[PDB]
Structure formats: C-alpha cells, structure tokens
Design a protein around this ligand. Structure first.
Ligand SMILES: Cc1cc(Br)c2c(CP(=O)(O)O)cc(=O)oc2c1
Ligand SMILES: [Zn+2]
Ligand SMILES: [Zn+2]
Length: 229
C-alpha cells in the first residue's frame, strides 16, 4: 500500500510506523530512492533520517501533518551523507530537535551537510549513552561499528518487529554493497552482524535503498562484506 504524495512515497509498516521514500537524480547513478522512518509514540511523532533535500523533508512534515496531525518531537539521522542529513535545515526551520552520532556532526560540514543540534555518544558495546538520547521513546539507537561509513548508526523500534539498518544493510538479493567511497571494508561484515545481534527479535529489516526485507538482508549483506576482506 504505497502512497504517492507529491514526489515522495509513504508506506505503512506497522500500526505506528511508516517508511518515507525520496528520490535524487544523481548524475551517473539514476534517480536513487532513499528510505527513512516515521514513528508515532503516543501524542508525538519521531523521525529517522531526512529526505535528500530540504524541500523534500518539508514535504515529509506536510505528510505527517495531514496523515498523523501530531507534533514531531525529534529526528535522528543515521550518518553524514545527503540521503540521511540533506534536509536538516528543514527540520530546524520547523522547530524540531535533531540528533546524530557525534561523529556525524563533526563530519557534517566537510560533507556539505548541516549538523544536527545534539550529539549522540555510544558505549564501547555500541548502545547509545542514554543521557544523550532523551525522550527517544521506543527508538533504540545502536552503533554497530564502521561499515557503509565510520559513523553509521542503526535504530530498533521497541514494541514492533522492525529494525532500521540505514545504508549499512542491503536487501537479500542485492548484487553489491553500493557506495563504498566512505566505507570501512575490513569491518563491514562484523558491523552488519553486530546490527543483527543487537536486534534479534526484528523480523522486518528496513534499509535505505530497498523495500523492507526479512533478516536474510542481514546475512546476505554480511556474506557479501566477507568478500571485501
Ligand atoms: C559517489 C556516491 C556518493 C553517494 Br554519498 C551516493 C549515495 C548516498 P549513500 O547511499 O552512500 O548514503 C547514493 C548512491 O546511490 O550513490 C552514491 C554515490
Ligand atoms: Zn551514505
Ligand atoms: Zn545509501
């Protein structure tokens, strides 16, 4: 049940969870879809990842207003590339509190991104330091190790069967690991497996560039990444 809304696509995944999809015509790579998440937690909405652009991200907020009609309490973005952080200014213009891995905020200017307002830090075992992620509700933020990028983070949704791998995870039939320009090829496989181990109950794996898949997305991604070493 995909819903076309302007140039974006929205798909309900669970009673309180929707996937947002936006597109950027990247010369040399076609019009690339990127997915994030929208989660209703009681009387507020939480967003995972921007769209590629400010205008698209404002359209996400317009869809939220029309389909949910509750305030967006915060957004968390999953690394410092345009598909995940390109719309930061639109969130700030809307008055939404924004969060990213401290490393993502440090990298943002050189990547052409605007930093989030708040920095997440992580324990040695990968779980977010809880004081840095206040009021995250059901969102469980995990740093699995370097993979697609050194700063990539992942998000589970407590109370659902959903976990979000962002650009770390590719679908179970993917032919490649995509853009490795900023990747850590030696650690990728272990990081993919650590994501799976952090969210063992998640049977629906959501990711940046394919429709939600089974956990075979994790095993297949890791198996491809074993070849990078
Ligand atoms: C060279 C290059 C750089 C990026 Br920054 C991308 C992205 C964004 P990402 O998915 O790596 O976060 C998507 C893509 O399709 O091709 C790219 C190629
Ligand atoms: Zn990326
Ligand atoms: Zn990506």
């Amino acid at each position: 049940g995909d819903q076309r809304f302007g140039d974006l696509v929205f798909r309900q995944l669970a009673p309180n969870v929707w996937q947002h999809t936006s597109y950027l015509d990247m010369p040399g790579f076609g019009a690339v879809a990127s997915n994030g998440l929208i989660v209703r937690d009681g009387g507020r909405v939480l967003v995972v990842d921007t769209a590629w652009t400010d205008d698209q991200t404002a359209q996400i907020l317009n869809w939220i207003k029309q389909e949910i009609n509750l305030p967006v309490a915060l957004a968390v973005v999953t690394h410092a590339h345009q598909d995940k952080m390109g719309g930061m200014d639109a969130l700030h213009a809307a008055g939404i509190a924004t969060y990213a891995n401290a490393l993502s905020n440090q990298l943002a200017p050189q990547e052409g991104m605007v930093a989030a307002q708040h920095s997440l830090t992580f324990a040695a075992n990968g779980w977010v330091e809880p004081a840095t992620a206040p009021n995250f509700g059901p969102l469980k933020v995990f740093y699995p190790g370097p993979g697609h990028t050194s700063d990539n983070i992942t998000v589970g949704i407590d109370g659902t069967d959903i976990a979000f791998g962002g650009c770390l995870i590719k679908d179970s039939k993917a032919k490649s690991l995509g853009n490795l320009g900023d990747a850590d090829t030696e650690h990728y496989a272990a990081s993919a497996r650590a994501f799976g181990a952090a969210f063992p109950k998640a049977s629906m794996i959501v990711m940046s560039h394919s429709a939600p898949d089974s956990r075979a997305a994790i095993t297949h991604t890791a198996r491809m990444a074993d070849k990078l070493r």
